[PDB]
Amino acid sequence: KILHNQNVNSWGPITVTPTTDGGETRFDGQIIVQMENDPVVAKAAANLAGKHAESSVVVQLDSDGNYRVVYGDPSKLDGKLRWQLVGHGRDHSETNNTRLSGYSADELAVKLAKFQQSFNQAENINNKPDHISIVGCSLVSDDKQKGFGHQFINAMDANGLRVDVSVRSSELAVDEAGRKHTKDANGDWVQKAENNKVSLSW
Ligand SMILES: *[C@@H](C(=O)N(CC(C)C)NC(=O)[C@H](CC(C)C)NC(=O)[C@H](CC(C)C)NC(=O)OCc1ccccc1)[C@H](O)C(=O)OCC
Ligand SMILES: O=P(O)(O)O[C@H]1[C@H](OP(=O)(O)O)[C@@H](OP(=O)(O)O)[C@H](OP(=O)(O)O)[C@@H](OP(=O)(O)O)[C@H]1OP(=O)(O)O
Numbered sequence: 001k002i003l004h005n006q007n008v009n010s011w012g013p014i015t016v017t018p019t020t021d022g023g024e025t026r027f028d029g030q031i032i033v034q035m036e037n038d039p040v041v042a043k044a045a046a047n048l049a050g051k052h053a054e055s056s057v058v059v060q061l062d063s064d065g066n067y068r069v070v071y072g073d074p075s076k077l078d079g080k081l082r083w084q085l086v087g088h089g090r091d092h093s094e095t096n097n098t099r100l101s102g103y104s105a106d107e108l109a110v111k112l113a114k115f116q117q118s119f120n121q122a123e124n125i126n127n128k129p130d131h132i133s134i135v136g137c138s139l140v141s142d143d144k145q146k147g148f149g150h151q152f153i154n155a156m157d158a159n160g161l162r163v164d165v166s167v168r169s170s171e172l173a174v175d176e177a178g179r180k181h182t183k184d185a186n187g188d189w190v191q192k193a194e195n196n197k198v199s200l201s202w
């Protein structure tokens with residue numbers, strides 16, 4: 001897995017195939033934030049957007065805090081917003097992975113804050129995300145008590161963004177319908193494994 005998070009102008013574009021089985025979503029709008037230029041991450045970002053295409057915006061964000069919209073209409077973003085951050089979790093520790101798309105929890109927070117400022121300045125949309133869903137492999141401890149997710153929710157706060165964060169402690173996988181799958185003890189992929197996920201709130 002070659003890490004590529006620099007220069008968003010050089011990233012591959014994406015193609016979304018909307019689905020009909022999407023269903024309801026407690027979010028009026030969402031932004032799928034593609035954190036690295038990796039073929040898998042790109043498709044998972046596209047698939048997630050496809051689950052609620054009409055209200056999903058896909059953005060590509062690099063290490064300079066620069067971005068570009070690669071799908072959807074950011075003018076329509078309004079009401080309760082979600083951000084699904086898509087990338088590879090890497091660098092294992094006693095509290096599981098320590099970096100998403102090559103960024104530590106604190107660095108990710110900074111890029112996201114830089115992003116928020118730019119986005120609001122460009123699209124004139126000062127709506128902060130209501131929830132953040134981290135779509136990368138095991139970025140919180142098994143016990144859900146420590147890890148990347150916990151450093152992140154705190155760094156985000158320190159950076160002007162108070163938000164709830166959902167994160168998984170295990171392996172993660174997005175299917176063609178935009179649905180998440182986690183890996184359990186036996187090593188088989190499953191869905192709705194609540195033991196493999198935690199939701200951090202204020
Ligand atoms: C795991 C990681 O960070 N990560 C990124 C996702 C965006 C969450 N995982 C994947 O890359 C995963 C394979 C890894 C080896 C775990 N692949 C997918 O999620 C992939 C995305 C497609 C849209 C391209 N889907 C996939 O193969 O589907 C599996 C599936 C299909 C159908 C039903 C159920 C499951 C990180 O790299 C890590 O820590 O693991 C390395 C060993
Ligand atoms: O309505 P569902 O089919 O069960 O979809 C849910 C729902 O996502 P949608 O907004 O697309 O419905 C959850 O969103 P929340 O309202 O709970 O925030 C999401 O949880 P995250 O936001 O934490 O991702 C969860 O994903 P997960 O599998 O991680 O629980 C996902 O279920 P699917 O994975 O089946 O889409």
Ligand code: NA
Pocket residue numbers: 022023024025026
């Ligand atoms: Na739903």
